[PDB]
Amino acid sequence: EKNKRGGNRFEPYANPT
Amino acid sequence: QGLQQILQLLKESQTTIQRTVQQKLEQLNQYFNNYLIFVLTKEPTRSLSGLILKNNVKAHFQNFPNGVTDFIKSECLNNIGDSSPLIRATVGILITTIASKGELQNWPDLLPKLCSLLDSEDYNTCEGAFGALQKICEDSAEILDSDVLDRPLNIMIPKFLQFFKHSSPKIRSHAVACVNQFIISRTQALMLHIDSFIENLFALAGDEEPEVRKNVCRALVMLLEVRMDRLLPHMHNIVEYMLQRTQDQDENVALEACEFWLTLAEQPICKDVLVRHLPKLIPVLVNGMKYSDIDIILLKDDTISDWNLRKCSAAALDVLANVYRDELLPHILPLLKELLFHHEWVVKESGILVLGAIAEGCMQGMIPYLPELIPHLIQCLSDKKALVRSITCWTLSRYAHWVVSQPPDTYLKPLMTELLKRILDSNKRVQEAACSAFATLEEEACTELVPYLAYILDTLVFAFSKYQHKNLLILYDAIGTLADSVGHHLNKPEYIQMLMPPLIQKWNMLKDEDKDLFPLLECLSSVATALQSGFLPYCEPVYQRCVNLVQKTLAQAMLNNAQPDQYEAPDKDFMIVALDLLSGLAEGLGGNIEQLVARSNILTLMYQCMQDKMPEVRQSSFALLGDLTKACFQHVKPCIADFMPILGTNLNPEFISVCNNATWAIGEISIQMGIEMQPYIPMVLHQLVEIINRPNTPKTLLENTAITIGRLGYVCPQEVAPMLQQFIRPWCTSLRNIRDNEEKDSAFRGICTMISVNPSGVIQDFIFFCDAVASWINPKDDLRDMFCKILHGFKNQVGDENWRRFSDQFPLPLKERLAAFYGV
Numbered sequence: 001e002k003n004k005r006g007g008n009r010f011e012p013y014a015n016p017t
Numbered sequence: 018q019g020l021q022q023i024l025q026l027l028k029e030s031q032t033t034i035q036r037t038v039q040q041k042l043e044q045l046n047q048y049f050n051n052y053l054i055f056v057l058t059k060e061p062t063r064s065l066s067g068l069i070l071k072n073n074v075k076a077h078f079q080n081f082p083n084g085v086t087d088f089i090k091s092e093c094l095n096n097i098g099d100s101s102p103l104i105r106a107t108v109g110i111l112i113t114t115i116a117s118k119g120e121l122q123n124w125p126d127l128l129p130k131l132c133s134l135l136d137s138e139d140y141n142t143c144e145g146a147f148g149a150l151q152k153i154c155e156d157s158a159e160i161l162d163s164d165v166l167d168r169p170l171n172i173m174i175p176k177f178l179q180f181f182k183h184s185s186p187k188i189r190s191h192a193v194a195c196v197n198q199f200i201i202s203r204t205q206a207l208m209l210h211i212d213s214f215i216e217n218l219f220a221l222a223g224d225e226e227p228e229v230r231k232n233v234c235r236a237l238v239m240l241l242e243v244r245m246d247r248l249l250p251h252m253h254n255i256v257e258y259m260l261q262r263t264q265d266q267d268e269n270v271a272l273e274a275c276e277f278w279l280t281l282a283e284q285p286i287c288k289d290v291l292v293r294h295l296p297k298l299i300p301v302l303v304n305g306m307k308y309s310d311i312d313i314i315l316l317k318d319d320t321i322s323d324w325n326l327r328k329c330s331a332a333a334l335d336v337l338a339n340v341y342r343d344e345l346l347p348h349i350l351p352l353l354k355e356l357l358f359h360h361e362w363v364v365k366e367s368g369i370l371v372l373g374a375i376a377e378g379c380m381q382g383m384i385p386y387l388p389e390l391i392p393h394l395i396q397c398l399s400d401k402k403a404l405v406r407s408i409t410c411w412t413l414s415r416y417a418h419w420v421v422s423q424p425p426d427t428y429l430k431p432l433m434t435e436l437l438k439r440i441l442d443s444n445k446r447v448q449e450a451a452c453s454a455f456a457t458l459e460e461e462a463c464t465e466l467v468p469y470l471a472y473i474l475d476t477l478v479f480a481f482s483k484y485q486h487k488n489l490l491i492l493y494d495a496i497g498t499l500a501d502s503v504g505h506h507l508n509k510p511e512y513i514q515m516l517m518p519p520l521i522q523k524w525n526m527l528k529d530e531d532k533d534l535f536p537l538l539e540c541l542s543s544v545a546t547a548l549q550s551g552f553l554p555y556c557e558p559v560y561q562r563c564v565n566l567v568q569k570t571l572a573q574a575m576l577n578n579a580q581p582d583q584y585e586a587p588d589k590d591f592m593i594v595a596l597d598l599l600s601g602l603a604e605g606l607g608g609n610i611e612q613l614v615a616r617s618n619i620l621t622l623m624y625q626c627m628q629d630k631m632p633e634v635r636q637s638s639f640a641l642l643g644d645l646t647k648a649c650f651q652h653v654k655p656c657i658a659d660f661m662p663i664l665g666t667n668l669n670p671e672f673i674s675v676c677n678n679a680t681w682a683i684g685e686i687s688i689q690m691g692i693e694m695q696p697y698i699p700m701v702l703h704q705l706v707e708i709i710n711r712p713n714t715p716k717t718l719l720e721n722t723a724i725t726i727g728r729l730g731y732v733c734p735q736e737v738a739p740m741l742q743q744f745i746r747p748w749c750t751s752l753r754n755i756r757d758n759e760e761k762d763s764a765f766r767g768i769c770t771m772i773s774v775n776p777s778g779v780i781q782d783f784i785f786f787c788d789a790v791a792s793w794i795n796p797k798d799d800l801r802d803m804f805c806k807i808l809h810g811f812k813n814q815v816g817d818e819n820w821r822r823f824s825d826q827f828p829l830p831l832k833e834r835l836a837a838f839y840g841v
Contacts, residue, residue, distance in 0.1 A: 001681055001717075001720070001721050001724070001760065002600070002604075002640040002643060002644065002678060002681055003636075003640065003674055003677055003678060003717075004539060004593075004597065004633075005535045005536070005539050005590060005593065005594055005597075006490070006493075006494055006535065006536050006539060008490050008491055008494065008536075009453040009456065009457070009491065009494065010407075010410075010411060010449050010450045010452075010453035010454070010491070011411075012328065012331060012370060012373070012408060012411060013327075013328035013329075013331040013332045013335070013374075014328075015324065015328070015332060016323050016324055017324075
């Protein structure tokens with residue numbers, strides 16, 4: 001039960017705010 | 018003079034000769050700018066010089082000081098209202114460029130002269146001053162107060178509000194913008210002149226000039242968070258305004274209004290106040306999610322604005338689907354029937370977006386319609402038009418969960434095949450979309466993927482050839498995700514042969530400083546765990562390289578610490594990544610890692626990583642600790658005395674995953690550490706019980722905390738049992754949910770050992786313990802004995818009739834299992 005650097009998956013409406 | 022020699026260099030700049038005077042002027046800055054503002058202040062010939070000067074300021078201002086600097090300033094502040102609109106524009110651009118480079122301290126005379134000139138009878142000076150004043154307010158992250166202004170905001174705010182009534186549209190805007198730059202700070206002068214601001218905005222609502230309307234929207238949007246109490250009495254009558262503001266022509270106002278629903282939604286008040294409006298709003302949002310001449314730019318480098326009306330409207334919809342859940346469907350479903358099947362594609366795809374947009378929110382109310390829809394999307398996957406492909410990928414991933422819950426032939430198998438095709442699609446935006454979507458699918462469809470690994474590996478490994486940078490980063494994600502979602506099934510000579518060879522080129526190709534290692538090594542760490550001992554040929558270079566990264570970024574960090582000016586801080590993501598791979602090597606190689614660990618200086622390194630300022634660094638090395646502790650305790654033990662004090666001071670719930678890995682390591686330590694763990698228990702035990710009891714910690718932390726306490730009990734019941742009377746309640750509440758793994762068996766042995774040292778500290782809440790023992794379906798033949806004696810101990814102590822009395826608060830299975838299985 002141990003516990004990244006990315007999350008560059010595709011989104012149609014990601015907010016740069 | 019030599020000004021005549023300058024007047025030739027400017028009048029030559031105004032295709033080959035251009036680069037000649039451009040490098041001749043930018044270089045003559047050593048000898049200068051006193052001539053630049055001289056030409057502007059004493060048309061296109063002299064407007065250029067002011068902009069040449071502007072670029073001298075922007076590129077090298079510290080080389081300026083008082084000789085020129087003060088003459089520049091005094092010169093254009095007297096010309097702030099020149100009646101030639103190009104000159105005034107040149108001066109204004111200058112004013113504001115000087116005023117962001119050389120801070121506000123270096124030009125204190127400025128703002129008070131600008132605030133003064135707003136009251137000029139000459140309109141050009143008013144408009145000029147108000148313009149620069151807006152640019153300064155806005156281009157200033159820090160706000161503006163009475164110090165710099167030379168007026169109280171008590172006088173300055175109402176004075177802006179006054180200009181809301183100026184005839185000239187250009188000024189009213191300037192006015193609203195200036196006041197707008199004070200809503201966030203919640204500054205008092207505005208909070209007190211609040212009802213005037215509101216009343217004034219409302220008056221400006223129906224303006225004609227688009228800029229004013231944007232500024233009014235942008236205002237009403239801000240006020241919504243900051244000062245909800247005032248707006249609420251006007252909500253419904255002001256919703257309808259914003260509603261007309263989205264349909265409003267001029268997209269720059271449409272967008273600026275659309276934000277209203279994003280922020281409005283995030284407010285508790287939303288659900289109940291907005292119900293009446295959904296009939297009119299939802300259609301309007303869906304209409305915004307369509308496309309326009311965006312296509313023209315999008316088909317022919319293929320990129321548009323990062324944020325725009327389409328995204329905003331979609332985001333609005335996503336959130337709205339989360340606020341209302343299923344009650345949203347009667348407002349969309351009809352319109353969704355009309356869109357999803359449609360001859361005009363630009364329409365069909367907007368419907369596809371809508372479909373995905375509302376996935377998360379409406380999931381439950383959307384299950385009925387899925388058997389119809391999922392296969393419809395699967396045929397769309399192979400639509401003629403790319404933009405219609407890419408997004409059905411996405412929309413499908415949004416439903417990946419359900420797809421996996423149905424029989425794997427109906428939906429999974431066709432979806433997966435069509436995806437693996439799309440991953441290799443002709444154009445980039447489909448590759449990206451489809452590849453990402455497949456990674457989402459892996460996550461959900463776990464071992465259901467083993468039937469297809471050969472084809473899956475064929476696809477991914479092939480893309481390594483096709484793909485380039487942008488999409489390559491997502492491919493790493495998808496490859497790593499496979500390894501995770503499939504695990505050891507991947508460890509087969511046939512598979513290692515396809516997968517590894519390309520991953521190593523990338524490895525040998527990339528130099529140590531190359532930020533491209535991040536997605537690679539977080540991929541390789543998932544491979545390294547999934548293949549297990551399969552990794553052996555490759556581990557020696559992989560291991561050494563990570564330690565060097567870790568050593569290096571530590572070394573670099575030390576230097577920077579001793580001398581921030583002479584040495585720079587390092588990118589810590591490099592070790593956060595290195596550590597996480599050594600961790601995943603420690604997990605898949607288990608024992609086989611020892612020698613590499615023995616020879617290396619990894620543990621000396623880890624000890625500073627645990628002490629690091631940055632949570633993520635700590636978090637990674639604790640996970641690494643626990644991993645090594647499991648793998649080769651031979652080498653870890655010789656310094657449990659150094660780690661425990663760290664692990665203890667790191668049991669802090671505000672860093673939830675640093676804390677989660679701490680708790681986990683401690684637990685794993687004890688197993689290896691046997692009785693020796695006893696002097697260390699005081700270090701950890703109290704705060705550990707704090708965490709088990711403090712409310713609103715995620716189940717993931719509670720569960721680990723519970724496992725750890727048990728394990729610490731099992732091994733040292735003498736020091737752990739005294740406390741028993743305090744944690745059992747949340748302990749059982751937590752470990753009642755977990756399946757009968759070894760983690761659990763280890764944990765329950767803990768309390769069973771702790772009970773028969775301090776039974777007094779369990780009777781008061783013996784219910785929880787009984788639920789917890791009715792959690793077990795198959796205990797080891799000696800653990801059910803530990804339950805047996807402990808429960809019988811409670812039957813003989815309390816008595817036949819007094820125990821029958823106790824079981825009356827038991828659902829029948831719990832009672833029948835606690836009676837047939839244990840004999841009580």
